[PDB]
Amino acid sequence: VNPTVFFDIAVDGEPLGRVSFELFADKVPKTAENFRALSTGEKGFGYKGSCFHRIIPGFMCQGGDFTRHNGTGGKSIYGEKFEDENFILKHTGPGILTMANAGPNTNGSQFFICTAKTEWLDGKHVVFGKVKEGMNIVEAMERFGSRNGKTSKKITIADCGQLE
C-alpha cells in the first residue's frame, strides 16, 4: 500500500488543520521517497517549519524551499538535483501533488499542490501524489494568494510526518 504523509498547516502561527497525502510509490518510487523522507525528517533535514512562498489562485500552492524559503533553494535527499523519473501520471484535477523544477532533470525539494486541473504541466512536471484528506484546507490556503503568487499571510508547515 502506498505511504501516507501529513502536513499540519499554520497561518501566522495559528493552526488551520492537517492535510494528508498519498504518495504514488508504486509508479514513481524515487520521487515519492524524496518527499516522504523530507516529510519525516529522517535524514536530518526537511519540510518542518518551511513555508508556502508562492500561491496562485486557480493554479497551485508552492512550497518545499526549506533552505532559503523563497524559491531559490531546496535540496533532495540524493545530494543533487535529480532526473524526471517518469510522466506516467497526469495532472487530472485539484489535489494533485507534482514536482516544481527549473527545467528538465532539475528536481530538488520544491512541489506544487494543484488547486485545479493543470494540464499545461503534463509531460514537464512529475506527478507523485495526491491529497487524501484536508482538501478544504488547501482551498483556504489558496485564498491567501494573489497575482504572481504573493501571499498575504505566512503559511507554514508546523509539523509533518508519516502515518501508519
Side-chain angles (χ1 to χ4, degrees):
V1 169
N2 289 329
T4 297
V5 297
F6 71 89
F7 290 169
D8 283 322
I9 302 294
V11 181
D12 284 344
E14 282 183 27
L16 206 56
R18 181 168 291 198
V19 183
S20 65
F21 308 97
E22 174 182 349
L23 305 179
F24 302 140
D26 63 332
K27 293 184 185 153
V28 296
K30 187 167 184 184
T31 303
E33 172 72 1
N34 181 62
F35 189 93
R36 190 196 61 72
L38 293 170
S39 293
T40 62
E42 68 198 65
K43 307 291 180 178
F45 53 87
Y47 294 141
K48 183 174 186 174
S50 65
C51 78
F52 290 83
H53 62 275
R54 188 176 282 150
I55 299 180
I56 303 174
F59 183 3
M60 54 75 169
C61 301
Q62 180 178 357
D65 180 357
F66 59 88
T67 64
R68 299 207 182 293
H69 298 106
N70 64 9
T72 65
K75 69 185 180 176
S76 77
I77 63 167
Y78 305 119
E80 65 182 320
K81 295 194 274 191
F82 66 102
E83 70 279 351
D84 297 314
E85 185 165 17
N86 63 60
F87 304 109
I88 290 161
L89 299 169
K90 307 312 168 176
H91 299 83
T92 52
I96 287 290
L97 207 59
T98 188
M99 288 301 286
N101 62 53
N105 298 329
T106 60
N107 296 290
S109 60
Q110 292 190 54
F111 57 90
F112 297 151
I113 307 170
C114 300
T115 57
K117 182 179 185 188
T118 60
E119 74 271 8
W120 52 91
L121 299 185
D122 287 346
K124 289 175 273 180
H125 295 263
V126 178
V127 172
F128 67 93
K130 67 177 173 202
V131 172
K132 189 176 206 163
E133 289 191 319
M135 197 64 207
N136 294 267
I137 294 161
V138 177
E139 290 177 13
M141 292 167 57
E142 188 178 37
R143 286 194 277 275
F144 300 116
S146 60
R147 38 182 57 158
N148 304 115
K150 191 194 115 296
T151 68
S152 57
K153 289 177 139 75
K154 194 71 119 59
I155 309 305
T156 61
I157 301 167
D159 201 8
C160 48
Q162 179 171 322
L163 298 185
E164 66 157 281

